[PDB]
Write an enzyme that holds these catalytic residues in place. Structure first.
Site, short mmCIF file in Angstrom:
data_model
loop_
_atom_site.label_atom_id
_atom_site.label_comp_id
_atom_site.label_asym_id
_atom_site.label_seq_id
_atom_site.Cartn_x
_atom_site.Cartn_y
_atom_site.Cartn_z
N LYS D 11 0.84 -1.25 0.00
CA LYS D 11 0.06 0.04 0.03
C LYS D 11 0.69 1.24 -0.04
O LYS D 11 2.21 0.85 0.21
CB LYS D 11 -1.00 0.01 1.30
CG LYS D 11 -1.76 -1.26 1.35
CD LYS D 11 -2.66 -1.13 3.01
CE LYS D 11 -3.68 -2.04 3.18
NZ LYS D 11 -4.29 -2.13 4.70
N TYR D 51 -12.34 -1.56 -0.98
CA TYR D 51 -12.95 -1.63 0.45
C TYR D 51 -14.58 -1.55 0.60
O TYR D 51 -15.14 -1.59 1.73
CB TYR D 51 -11.84 -0.91 1.27
CG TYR D 51 -10.56 -1.21 1.73
CD1 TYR D 51 -10.23 -2.31 2.05
CD2 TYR D 51 -9.59 -0.12 1.13
CE1 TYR D 51 -8.79 -2.45 2.44
CE2 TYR D 51 -8.22 -0.42 1.12
CZ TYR D 51 -7.85 -1.59 1.98
OH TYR D 51 -6.44 -1.97 2.00
N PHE D 59 -13.75 4.42 10.14
CA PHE D 59 -12.35 4.83 9.41
C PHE D 59 -12.41 4.65 7.98
O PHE D 59 -11.75 5.23 7.30
CB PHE D 59 -11.09 3.57 10.02
CG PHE D 59 -11.59 2.18 9.68
CD1 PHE D 59 -11.36 1.61 8.57
CD2 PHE D 59 -11.84 1.48 10.79
CE1 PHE D 59 -11.81 0.30 8.17
CE2 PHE D 59 -12.43 -0.12 10.56
CZ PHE D 59 -12.27 -0.58 9.45
N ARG D 104 3.65 -7.49 8.59
CA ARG D 104 3.19 -6.33 9.35
C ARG D 104 4.13 -6.58 10.52
O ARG D 104 3.91 -5.29 11.20
CB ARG D 104 1.50 -6.37 9.62
CG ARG D 104 0.79 -6.06 8.49
CD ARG D 104 -0.47 -6.59 8.57
NE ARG D 104 -1.29 -6.11 7.42
CZ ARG D 104 -2.73 -6.26 7.25
NH1 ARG D 104 -3.19 -7.68 8.12
NH2 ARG D 104 -3.45 -6.15 6.26
N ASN D 114 -0.52 -0.23 7.59
CA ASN D 114 -0.01 -1.31 7.68
C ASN D 114 0.35 -2.34 6.44
O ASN D 114 0.57 -3.42 6.46
CB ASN D 114 -1.21 -2.22 8.46
CG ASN D 114 -2.50 -2.58 7.69
OD1 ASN D 114 -2.62 -2.20 6.28
ND2 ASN D 114 -3.30 -3.18 8.28
N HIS D 117 -1.76 -5.36 1.84
CA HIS D 117 -3.18 -5.97 1.80
C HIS D 117 -3.10 -7.43 1.52
O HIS D 117 -2.20 -7.70 0.35
CB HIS D 117 -4.08 -5.03 0.86
CG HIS D 117 -5.47 -5.86 0.57
ND1 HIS D 117 -6.75 -5.95 1.13
CD2 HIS D 117 -5.54 -7.09 -0.34
CE1 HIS D 117 -7.45 -6.62 0.61
NE2 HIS D 117 -6.74 -7.28 -0.47
N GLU D 128 -11.02 -9.83 -5.96
CA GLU D 128 -9.72 -8.65 -6.22
C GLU D 128 -8.97 -8.95 -7.39
O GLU D 128 -8.69 -7.94 -7.97
CB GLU D 128 -9.10 -8.66 -4.77
CG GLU D 128 -10.05 -8.68 -3.49
CD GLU D 128 -9.16 -8.61 -2.07
OE1 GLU D 128 -8.15 -9.08 -2.07
OE2 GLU D 128 -9.86 -8.26 -1.08
N1 ADP Z 1 -9.42 0.25 13.58
C1 ADP Z 1 -9.02 0.63 12.38
N2 ADP Z 1 -8.51 2.00 12.26
C2 ADP Z 1 -7.90 2.42 11.09
N3 ADP Z 1 -7.99 1.65 9.96
C3 ADP Z 1 -8.38 0.40 10.00
C4 ADP Z 1 -8.71 -0.32 11.16
N4 ADP Z 1 -9.37 -1.66 10.95
C5 ADP Z 1 -8.85 -1.62 9.65
N5 ADP Z 1 -8.37 -0.63 9.13
C6 ADP Z 1 -8.02 -0.28 7.73
O1 ADP Z 1 -8.56 -1.02 6.95
C7 ADP Z 1 -7.94 -2.15 6.19
C8 ADP Z 1 -8.97 -3.39 5.91
O2 ADP Z 1 -9.45 -3.91 7.30
P1 ADP Z 1 -9.73 -5.31 7.29
O3 ADP Z 1 -10.08 -5.96 5.92
O4 ADP Z 1 -10.74 -5.80 8.54
O5 ADP Z 1 -8.16 -5.78 7.76
P2 ADP Z 1 -7.00 -6.71 6.90
O6 ADP Z 1 -6.58 -5.83 5.79
O7 ADP Z 1 -6.24 -7.43 7.70
O8 ADP Z 1 -7.79 -8.00 6.02
C9 ADP Z 1 -6.86 -2.27 7.33
O9 ADP Z 1 -5.80 -3.11 6.84
C10 ADP Z 1 -6.53 -0.87 7.92
O10 ADP Z 1 -5.39 -0.40 6.64
#
Ligand code: ADP
Ligand code: ADP
Ligand code: ADP
Ligand code: ADP
Ligand code: ADP
Ligand code: ADP
Lengths: 151, 151, 151, 151, 151, 151
Positions: D11, D51, D59, D104, D114, D117, D128
């Site tokens: 990212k 997303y 968020f 991560r 982080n 993805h 995707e």
């Molecule tokens: N509590 C939070 N605060 C801010 N950003 C978040 C939070 N949870 C998720 N995100 C953002 O959303 C992305 C997608 O969340 P999610 O799909 O649940 O996790 P993942 O990427 O590990 O599958 C995260 O990787 C992060 O960049």
């Protein structure tokens, strides 16, 4: 309990994919001592006696054929807890349940091709050591570092 | 909570085995900020006050003698969750329960020689920071990267 | 030409400093094929014969006694120009004339503690290999990636 | 089940902090196959549809603005268990619950930044993949190594 | 001769890019002994005095202001030929004349952002060390592996 | 001058050996900016045109057919002297004249399997980039650390 040893083998797929030095270096950085080393192609019988405990499993013959089909590298390492630390370093049998930072988690995908072997117990380590190595191919030496790693 | 700091120390065995840069680099790649740094040989009293909370343990005197027997490297790092992420990076007290990818899991074998120290809580981090460092040996700066690591 | 062989020895100082897998990894990266390996402590005899062609020099007995003070790891690598290239990976004789990126470049200070040894020519490789290895200690295999590495 | 694919994206913060090669190399050493690759700046709409499943989270808008603010690198990898092994390699959502050795856990501090993805399921990987890639930007090839990684 | 000392500074650009431990690790690999370390922001004064012997040059005030814009990490390494070898690990002045394998080779583009500094001679080392360090900031210790590194 | 661009291709042999991220990482370390990337199998046509300016040479059709036997990864990096420096990271044409530390130094044996390709001049970069990339496949961004890398 510093005199413990374990037997670690890189397997035909590990040797072919250029992973022997990587794996030697992990145990070195950890503080363990390399006391034995060779590269050879197991025979069918070597492959069978090494995995003797699983002659009933339906993967056995594919395993024995795979293990005997190219050179493996055998090693013995010595230190405190070397057998169980060996297995924590190698990772779960299936590379899919194996964590990043472990040998199988970092370099392998399939349980059938999982790069490396490690004794799973002290009594098994002592039996694998005696199978592959003659006493006398086992170098005795003392690390200039044992006082930095132990006490 | 970006202003959190923790104190990390490489210990005499870590310094002797050439592990200070490796460990500095782990916290750097993670995104943390180095705000303080020195190399010195603790005294008995430094070794005793640093591990003050364990004067009743029968390992204490061997520990205080070992910690005071050569140079350690002290550091302070700053960022979100740096104390607890510090401890996840260091690994379990015993290097045998410590996972591959952690500092103690990758480089150490014996609980008595486990290369590195890390504050275990914020209040403990603040007390170890003030023990070893004068305010003023603590550089204040801002990473050109904080907007890539936080928001 | 593709069956050219070279003898690499890690010296006692390379083994004592935890460099064995690092040097193996570098040969493997570059695409060479490991065919023989072992660990043992050279007798003074084997030190004298390994270095016969330099008995008249002043350093010779210093050299002799050092090389037989500790286990070494002997290797034989196969591939195209592996003799010139092994020399190249190891770097100049005297680490003071060794570029970073080479094993002596990165790891060594004294010509007397220069970590590793490599055949200087094809003739010398043939001698040192038959010197240190019996015919049955040699593996013969073909690397799956021969076509990715060799025109 | 070798034909499974997953979509991995570095990212904007991962691209800016110089982490794309590091992450490509982790999946390579593991034995996985890179079948697709590009670098682009998502649009708001791309950031929103990617997303899509979290439009209710508070968020979301900060996420969509962050994801669309610089170049990401998209990839598709192919092998057995690649989706779930992908997620074990990436680490927990919050870099603070993420273990050392995971992407991560090794390089990030904040859940909001982080670095990378990864598809979280096969059906999500297939959606995707089709979002970011046209069929035809998907190279079909066969690794010279599949017999070393599978059977 | 084995007590030769050198002064290495990581410049503000080395610190801001997360290179500190990488450069420390490389000195340590090569077998050198770290005896003094710290982080601080040079005042303009200290920039002028550190670089006094180049005040007449055109780049000098650009140079002066940059070197005092951010923390640097100062170090003093001990060992045999550590002055010539430090120069060697860092590579040419101008990264455009720097080989890969060297710190500027691998990490730097502009002569003005060249990451690190190293004493050019023994005289200069003696000056820059007393310059930047008080007698009590220096550790004196002996490395357990002195015999593996020094004839 | 800071907008100079270069074209790097990983050859089919670089992709088949798991080198893609290793080469990307090295450009990124040195501070360059990635702006375009992809994977595809060159047709014979594209091999001929990529190498037009060498059609008269004997190796040319060997060369042509190899380069179009497998996916390659194409890249375009931006920065100051990125053309000379890319050549420098890759090392000499013929890995037999390549220093360790360079990509061919470390990874390649045959001039015919030399892993990677890099523009030889600015003119050639301009040609090979418009050759291999459409205007819309190029990212344009600015790196947060431009000031740490460029005077
Ligand atoms: N509590 C939070 N605060 C801010 N950003 C978040 C939070 N949870 C998720 N995100 C953002 O959303 C992305 C997608 O969340 P999610 O799909 O649940 O996790 P993942 O990427 O590990 O599958 C995260 O990787 C992060 O960049
Ligand atoms: N389900 C399976 N399918 C194919 N091969 C297997 C399977 N389980 C084990 N093997 C092969 O057998 C070797 C020995 O199995 P086992 O002793 O239970 O595991 P480990 O090597 O981790 O101690 C495995 O490492 C793998 O190469
Ligand atoms: N059973 C033990 N034997 C010898 N030394 C120990 C033992 N437990 C702890 N120590 C020494 O004490 C240090 C401090 O212990 P403690 O604070 O409980 O662990 P930690 O360093 O992980 O927070 C250890 O890191 C180790 O050097
Ligand atoms: N001038 C010298 N002084 C001290 N020791 C030396 C000297 N020359 C060589 N040695 C030691 O003996 C070995 C001699 O072999 P040599 O033909 O000089 O080169 P190489 O090891 O590069 O093949 C070295 O590798 C080193 O440990
Ligand atoms: N010609 C130049 N143009 C711009 N900046 C320069 C030039 N020469 C040196 N500098 C800057 O000033 C420093 C000068 O020290 P110098 O004696 O030239 O060599 P070194 O750093 O290799 O000891 C460099 O390290 C660099 O950041
Ligand atoms: N003399 C030769 N024999 C065989 N193959 C060659 C020869 N010269 C070049 N090649 C192959 O063709 C390519 C030619 O490009 P060239 O101008 O020679 O240099 P470069 O790749 O360093 O820009 C090489 O990268 C290589 O794979």
């Amino acid at each position: 309990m510093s005199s413990e040893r374990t037997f670690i083998a890189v397997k035909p797929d590990g040797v072919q994919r250029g992973l022997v030095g990587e794996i030697i270096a992990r145990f070195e950085r950890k503080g363990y001592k390399l006391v034995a080393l060779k590269i050879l192609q197991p025979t069918t019988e070597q492959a069978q006696g090494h995995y003797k405990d699983l002659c009933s499993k339906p993967f056995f013959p594919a395993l024995v054929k795979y293990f005997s089909s190219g050179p493996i590298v055998c090693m013995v390492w010595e230190g405190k807890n070397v057998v169980k630390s060996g297995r924590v370093l190698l990772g779960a049998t299936n590379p899919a349940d194996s964590q990043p930072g472990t040998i199988r988690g970092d370099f392998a995908v399939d349980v059938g091709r999982n790069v490396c072997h490690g004794s799973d117990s002290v009594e098994s380590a002592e039996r694998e050591i005696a199978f592959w190595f003659k006493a006398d191919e086992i170098a005795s030496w003392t690390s200039h570092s044992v006082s930095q790693i132990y006490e």
